[PDB]
């Protein structure tokens, strides 16, 4: 399958040094234009405008982050700086191990994410929508650091 199982992990340390964790599961689909590989890392939420070399002097994240990007309604960004896959490629250049797109406000992006390339990304690009997107963004919009685990299967 092209199904991606995504686990989102919230964690707190204790004085003993042992962690308490809380996991939320959800499902998306791997883009055919990205790798069909598993990935894992700290979530970094980015506004889709942040993947433009606009303005900027933008943030350096430690290598290995999982980008979570909620697409805008296309009416709000009619002049996109890069294609949606281009923005994923840009994240990978900036150290992302994977990108998860919430495409619920731009479901037509799935057409581009389902279309193959002879220059595919070497890292996975997952899209979520529906209840799965709602589950993801509810956790990401909490104050807390979270880790994502993306599993092929």
Author numbering: 56 to 208
From the primary publication:
Zinc RING finger 3 (ZNRF3) and its homolog RING finger 43 (RNF43) are trans-membrane E3 ubiquitin ligases that negatively regulate Wnt signaling. ZNRF3 and RNF43 contain an extracellular N-terminal protease-associated (PA) domain, a single pass trans-membrane helix and an intracellular C-terminal RING domain with E3 ligase activity. Interaction of ZNRF3 or RNF43 with complexes of frizzled receptors (FZD) and low-density lipoprotein receptor-related protein (LRP) 5/6 leads to Frizzled ubiquitination and endocytosis of the heterodimeric receptors, thereby reducing the capacity of Wnt-driven signal transduction.
Purified protein was crystallized and crystals exhibited space group P21 with cell dimensions a = 35.7 Å, b = 73.5 Å and c = 58.6 Å and β = 97.5°, contained two molecules per asymmetric unit and diffracted to 1.5 Å resolution. The ZNRF3 ectodomain adopts a typical PA-fold, previously found in e.g. subtilases, transferrin receptors and vacuolar sorting receptors. A disulphide bond Cys107-Cys136, which is present in both ZNRF3 and RNF43 connects the loop regions containing the first and second 310-helices. The N-terminal and C-terminal residues of the ectodomain form an anti-parallel β-sheet, β2-β1-β7, that packs against helix α3. In ZNRF3, strands β1 and β2 form an extended β-hairpin ‘flap’, while RNF43 is three residues shorter and displays a flexible loop in this region. In the crystal structure of ZNRF3, we observe two molecules in the asymmetric unit. The two molecules pack together making an extensive interface burying over ~1,000 Å2 surface area. In addition, we observe stacking of guanidinium groups of Arg178-Arg204’. Both C-termini of the dimer point to the same direction, making such arrangement plausible on the membrane.
